[PDB]
Amino acid sequence: MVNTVNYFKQKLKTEQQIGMWVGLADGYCAEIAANVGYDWLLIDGEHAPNDVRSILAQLQSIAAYPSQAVVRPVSGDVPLIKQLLDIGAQTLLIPMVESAEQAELMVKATRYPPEGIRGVGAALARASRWNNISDYLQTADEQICLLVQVESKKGLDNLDEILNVDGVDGIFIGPADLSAALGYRGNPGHEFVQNIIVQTIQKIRAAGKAAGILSADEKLAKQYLELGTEFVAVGVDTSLLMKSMKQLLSKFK
Amino acid sequence: MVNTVNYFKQKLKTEQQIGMWVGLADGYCAEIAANVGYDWLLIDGEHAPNDVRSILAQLQSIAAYPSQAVVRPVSGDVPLIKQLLDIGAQTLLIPMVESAEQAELMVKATRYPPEGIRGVGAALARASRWNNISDYLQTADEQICLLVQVESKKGLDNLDEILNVDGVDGIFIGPADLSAALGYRGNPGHEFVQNIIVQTIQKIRAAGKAAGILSADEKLAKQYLELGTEFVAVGVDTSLLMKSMKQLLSKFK
Amino acid sequence: MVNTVNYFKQKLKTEQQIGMWVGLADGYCAEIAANVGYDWLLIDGEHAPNDVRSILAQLQSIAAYPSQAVVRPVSGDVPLIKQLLDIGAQTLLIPMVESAEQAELMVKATRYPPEGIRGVGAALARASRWNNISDYLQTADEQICLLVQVESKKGLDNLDEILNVDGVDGIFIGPADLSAALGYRGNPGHEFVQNIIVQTIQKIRAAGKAAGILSADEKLAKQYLELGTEFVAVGVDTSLLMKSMKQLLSKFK
Amino acid sequence: MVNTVNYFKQKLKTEQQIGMWVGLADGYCAEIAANVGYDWLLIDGEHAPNDVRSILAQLQSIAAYPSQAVVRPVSGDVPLIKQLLDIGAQTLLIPMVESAEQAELMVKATRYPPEGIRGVGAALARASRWNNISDYLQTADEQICLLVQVESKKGLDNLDEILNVDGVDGIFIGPADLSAALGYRGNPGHEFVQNIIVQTIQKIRAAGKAAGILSADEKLAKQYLELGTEFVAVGVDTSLLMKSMKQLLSKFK
Amino acid sequence: MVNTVNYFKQKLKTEQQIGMWVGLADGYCAEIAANVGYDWLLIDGEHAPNDVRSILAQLQSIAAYPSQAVVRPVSGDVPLIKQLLDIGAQTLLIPMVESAEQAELMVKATRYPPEGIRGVGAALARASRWNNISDYLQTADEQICLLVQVESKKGLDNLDEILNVDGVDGIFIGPADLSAALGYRGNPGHEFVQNIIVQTIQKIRAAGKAAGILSADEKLAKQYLELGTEFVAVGVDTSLLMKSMKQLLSKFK
Amino acid sequence: MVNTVNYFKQKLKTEQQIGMWVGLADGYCAEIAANVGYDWLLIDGEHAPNDVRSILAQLQSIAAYPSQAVVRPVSGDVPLIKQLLDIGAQTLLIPMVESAEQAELMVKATRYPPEGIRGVGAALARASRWNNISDYLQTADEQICLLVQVESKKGLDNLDEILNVDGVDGIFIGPADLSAALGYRGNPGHEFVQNIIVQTIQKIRAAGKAAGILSADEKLAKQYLELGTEFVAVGVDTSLLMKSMKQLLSKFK
Ligand SMILES: [Ca+2]
Ligand SMILES: [Ca+2]
Ligand SMILES: [Mn+2]
Ligand SMILES: [Mn+2]
Ligand SMILES: [Mn+2]
Ligand SMILES: [Mn+2]
Ligand SMILES: [Mn+2]
Ligand SMILES: [Mn+2]
């Protein structure tokens, strides 16, 4: 077998990719999302009740569909990154990255020695299909994509430095965490926050990296798309389930 | 402790109850549905990948919320009915009921001996809260509600007979199974099917029984509500999740 | 490997065996019960939320301990008996057995063709340790023990006939189901019920079969032991957990 | 979306299909088997500790791979067939089929009314991808394949009759169950059994149905392939795991 | 919806709260404990085999009952605290807290930016009921209760400093860990340990914080209640299950 | 009850122990491996999708069999070590140990205070069988075995120092991680790597420590056995399953 091509990584330089957040945290719900036709599905290990085993089930569900899986670990934990890479997650979104030093540690966490610190366990990994992918150890990083989140003041204070780290493919802006860090908690739509988000997107793209963002606000998502943002998540499965069931009941109360 | 009051059973004679189908088959998804404020939630053991243990998890999720749980078993199987009652399901919807004899068997399956054939295991049952409900074995049937589905030609051929069975609290009409049985598979909206559904609803109510139905068609649901149908499900969680995610993506393609 | 010896079966002719009911329905709880030193543990597939997979987990937990596992299926269902035997349950307690014809069907359900109807799948079975027990198919029945419950009026009406069925090792009396069937629901301690239980025990032992019973009442359990009852369950894990936590709280209110 | 094409059904008339038995009963183990390149994978609900939910996980695992999934239910239970079809199993292998009447009931169990008795629940089914497959209810049976097992004397006594049932695509011969039924339990390699198996294969193919079989014996599997047997399983995952680990240890003991 | 009121937090200034340790690590066992009437239930993520998903199941079980849930994470890990808060744990017991600096980090781990470092993910959180609690982000901390354990020499060496940390609601004393740290392992009832525990309790209450402790020794528990200890756990589910099953067996040997 | 004897620990000074890697990550697969007769089974928490609860299931499976369980945690994390010891893992293999200071931290993580930092929670631990092992807290470390992996340049740079750490029972060499760290990724068979492995093995044994290694290469495994290596794993369950299924299919293509 040849390595599974990371089409999300390829498309970062060729098109704008529309994303759905998957926080329903099981293989059945991930498969329903996978039938819709999103460019990418974010399996949320940070803010949904997911562990390595529940993320594996969702990777296996989504694997039969064109939608590209991206996994967000709970933190930039190097052993957890090893685990998530070995179950076959090819794109990672690391939350709360705040310095070039931490971003460089995330790069190394995704690469085998001698260049990186990714633990070697190919015989056991769904990532190598248990060595059915014959040259996995020589070619794996070619299809690994590393994204980091800038979503704190220290993040923004280290933005130019993080954007000069080779092997960071994209910087994702977290409006919920960022708005809260800026004293506008629950109010990311404020001009003060949006002006910072827009400038941040322009700087990411000027340094030749992919810019990303999540907004459930259609108008803000279309505006981020008009600015050339490469990977835009436009909704969240839990939010769509709750809102659709509330809207339906309001037709009858 | 007193037995948990079956508010769904009480409201069959006092108000019209708005229902949501739950086929996402896990405790987390059931809890999201339970926060909306539906009168009832149908935990689907027939058409969603549920077993006794997954239904138990969803009962435990929903228990903290005012929405009343109704469980559909895969079939009118007497041992499975025993299992679902013991995990604390107070309202059961039996599919494909086709005779008074079968309807009477379902009544007996929900009542302790000597009058019924429900196996006795109160010490072990969430239904009795493991005997923390002190008189459970004397009072249990007071809060048990039995609904049967008429959704075949044989069911319609035995409708008057089923409607004379004491202990059947309600007859639910299944438009998908019924339209298929009538040679109008996937087309329940056809006048030939609707005329049968309307007459069936009038007969159920004329015999002093609660009538019920599921339609995701708002207009048909409101019409069934205008006819006095006591328990109307107006949507399905799997359908709402898929449709909401599809509608959102189409704003961006 | 040699077949796992069924010490419960052997001891039916040599000693009185003290049992604990296991309805906590998981591997961890089954293991706690296995450390106590009961002669047998009843894994309850009838009145606790168990399925074949949860029962397997509990067999695996208990396997490291001298306590002998007995599995009660939800009903005398021949395909479920097949499943429970193949996961390696060597002793089965069949509920609600009401005729010699049904008891003979249960015997056949436990034996390979050509003399029985047990489906053959030793390559796949924990029962054969995946053919690591080399002659499993020739010797399996030597370590299979079939118990049937008499716990209805029809049961009692067919008692002498069930007791002439070769391959029924033991008849277990269910006081909860029997007292209910006799119109003394939740009142098994009534003289009318107890007189029937005592005569039933004497008739079981006079026909050379093992007699069994469950009572959480110490005095009734000791009386059944004085009558020579071969397998006596003296308590239930769910009841002991609830009762000990209630008793502890009352010291503090 | 268009229905998932049942390539196993198509290939029954065009090539010989090599099968692996999957009894490791989880999604991870099913995915490892799915990487090998077998024409088909038998997910065993009869002789491995599987339920509807564990079979769904294995369907989701295997779905990303060319290997075609076949599900064996524990028995010809019509409600269980409904469940397995709705989770998206397109090929079923029914054990212990013993008459044209039972084979015809299995055909109907796989077809919607008015022609069959398959319960209609497309909105909820992975089979319809939750109605993402737009005309599922009109086209579903085109990609459903029904196989039945002849593996008893009554099976063989009704063979000509079962082979005249329209909608039975294939008859699978079970040498373990058949050898046991013929008084040669654990000894299917006996000439008396093999002569019956060969004649049975010739009769299946002469009536224009697909013949199938499992043998872990390479020589017998190649002989069944030389006779034109359309679907041949050549090994079992549990057997290969145990045998490979035993063979490895014997190099060191 | 309004935020779920934290009655445990409110009662720290108004009454003494009787607790039960929950280490049986599943939703069903948690529900049995929830029926008893304890003021609080400690879901033990440190010393029982729990993960975020098993803890969620137990929160969901307990949610239907007046008993207040308290969750002990395995360690004062900021990302795990984030996870446990988002699944809706309103009271946290942090083990092995040893400095004011660590206690202040725990406070910040429970509060949103800009004043704390709790990651923002309300759309996905059971804590916000998926934004069904409309102002969750503004009001969440009002119903969050932070308890820290002092159970090491370094803890005791930093006690006055931890007790001046604003946002620490309570200090829980761990006699098992403390007695071990003092060289009296498994002997917490020693006068040298008890004298330290009594002085620690008096100092906690003199600084206006709630004092807590676990003892399965009734006499020590009542003594701690006489000293005015605000939250006293009086037993452990695993210990009560094992002890009640042992005591029952000894009546029969 | 007496503590479970750690036969793996005893045999480190008396015989050479043959090991099988278990990365199929479930209780059923672990039981199949446990029936083979390996001296030890490595439950891989680092490179297979395991968590504390799945490792517990595999400990319970293996407990009934003579094969000794060794658990590899994902990293030398002190709270995770506490968790794995409490579920009853008596032998731990710590990956990527790179200094005497880290090796000494691992020793302390496995011992109760006051000499170590293992959290005390015996009442809740399968390790103590919930205090059914009466003196557990006094005797536990006697049956605890700590192994550390040297599999980096820093590890080799600190080898003599790690080998002088009292309480390190064995040093395991990881050829995959070591070959990668030496710039020979996927090529451990290279003379430059093998010469380092052989010298490392001689130093470990000269310092009176047990040496260990994994090789799926029979010739290399036998050579390590000829050098006196005390614990040699000779294969991996995932590799044996995939290879055996591939080899079987190639006989038929
Ligand atoms: Ca199940
Ligand atoms: Ca888990
Ligand atoms: Mn964020
Ligand atoms: Mn229907
Ligand atoms: Mn009974
Ligand atoms: Mn067969
Ligand atoms: Mn402690
Ligand atoms: Mn390694």
Q: Which two tokens stand for residue E68?
A: 């207040």
Report the residue count for chain E. Answer: 253
- Is residue D38 within 8 A of residue D20, CB to CB? The reply is yes
Q: What is the CA radius of gyration of chain F?
A: 18
Residue A242 distance to chain E (closest CA, Å): 7
F–B contact: 3+ Cβ pairs < 8 A: no
Q: Is C190 a catalytic residue?
A: no
- For residue A227, give the 3-state DSSP assignment: coil
Tokens of F180: 């990668």
In order of C153, D230, E205, the CA distances from C188 in angstroms are 14, 61, 53
The structure tokens listed for C241 are: 């957990």
Whether the link from the prior residue into B73 is cis, omega within 30° of 0, is: no
DSSP H or E run through C148: strand C145-150
One-letter amino acid at F250 equals S
Task: Name the residue range of residue B215's domain.
Answer: 1-253
Give residue for tokens 């277990």: C172
Considering only the beta carbons, identify the residue of A32, A49, A222 that sits closest to B238: A32
Residue E122 and residue E3: Cα distance in Å, rounded? 13
Does the CB of A129 have a partner CB in chain D at under 8 Å? Answer: yes
Q: Which two tokens stand for residue E155?
A: 């803890």
CA distance E60 to chain B (A): 5
- At which residue do the structure tokens 């391959």 appear? C167
Rounded CA Rg of chain A? 18
For chain E, the distance separating the N- and C-terminal CA atoms, rounded to the nearest angstrom, is 55
Touching check for B53 and chain E: CB below 8 Å? no
Give A202's contacts (C-beta < 8 A, 6+ positions apart). A227
CA of D47 from ligand 6 middle (Å) equals 9
The angle, 0 to 180 degrees and rounded to 10, between the axes of the packed helices F237-250 and D27-34 is: 40
Chain B residues within an 8 Å CB radius of C179: 120
Q: Give the A:F interface size as CB pairs under 8 Å.
A: 79
Task: Decide if F42 contacts F93 (C-beta within 8 A).
Answer: yes
Backbone angles phi and psi of E118, in degrees to 5? -65, 120
Residues on chain F touching D253 (C-beta within 8 angstroms)? 18
Range list of β-strands (E), B28-138: 40-44, 68-72, 91-94
Cα A221 to the chain's mean position, in Å?
16
DSSP 8-state class, residue B209: P
Bond into F79 cis (ω within 30): no
Q: Which residue has the tokens 């991206």?
A: A70
Q: Measure the CA–CA gap between A40 and D241, rounded to whole angstroms.
A: 36
**Chain B touched by E5 (CB under 8 Å):** no
Query: Is D35 within 8 Å of A61 when comparing Cβ atoms?
Result: no
Would you say E43 and E50 are in contact if contact means Cβ atoms under 8 Å apart?
A: yes
Catalytic residue among B11, B26, B47, B227: B47
Q: Compute the CA torsion angle B202, B208, B209, B213 (nearest 10 deg).
A: 30
B124 closest CB neighbour out of C23, C54, C180: C23
Q: What are phi and psi of F235, to 5 degrees?
A: -170, 180
A5/D contact by beta carbon, under 8 A: no
Dump strand ranges (E) for chain E.
17-22, 40-44, 68-72, 91-94, 145-150, 170-173, 210-214, 231-236
Q: How far apart are CA E230 and CA E213, in angstroms?
A: 9
Rounded CA separation A47/B230 (Å): 40
Chains near B with 3+ CB pairs less than 8 A apart are A, C, D, E
Secondary structure of chain F as H, E, C letters: CCCCCCHHHHHCCCCCEEEEEECCCCHHHHHHHHCCCCCEEEEECCCCCCCHHHHHHHHHHHCCCCCEEEEECCCCCHHHHHHHHHCCCCEEEECCCCCHHHHHHHHHHCCCCCCCCCCCCHHHCCCCCCCCCCCHHHHHHHHCEEEEEECCHHHHHCHHHHCCCCCCCEEEECHHHHHHHCCCCCCCCCHHHHHHHHHHHHHHHHCCCEEEEECCCHHHHHHHHHCCCCEEEEEEHHHHHHHHHHHHHHCCC
Give me the number of domains chain C comprises.
Answer: 1
Task: Please state the three-class secondary structure of chain D as a single string.
Answer: CCCCCCHHHHHCCCCCEEEEEECCCCHHHHHHHHCCCCCEEEEECCCCCCCHHHHHHHHHHHCCCCCEEEEECCCCCHHHHHHHHHCCCCEEEECCCCCHHHHHHHHHHCCCCCCCCCCCCHHHCHHHCCCCCCCHHHHHHHHCEEEEEECCHHHHHCHHHHCCCCCCCEEEECHHHHHHHCCCCCCCCCHHHHHHHHHHHHHHHHCCCEEEEECCCHHHHHHHHHCCCCEEEEEEHHHHHHHHHHHHHHCCC
CA gap D170, D144 in Å, rounded: 12
Cα-trace Rg, chain C: 18
Resolution in A: 2.0
Distance CA(E206)–CA(B185), nearest Å, equals 75
Residue partners of E198: CB distance under 8 A and separation at least 6: E227
For residue B210, give the H/E element and its range: strand B210-214
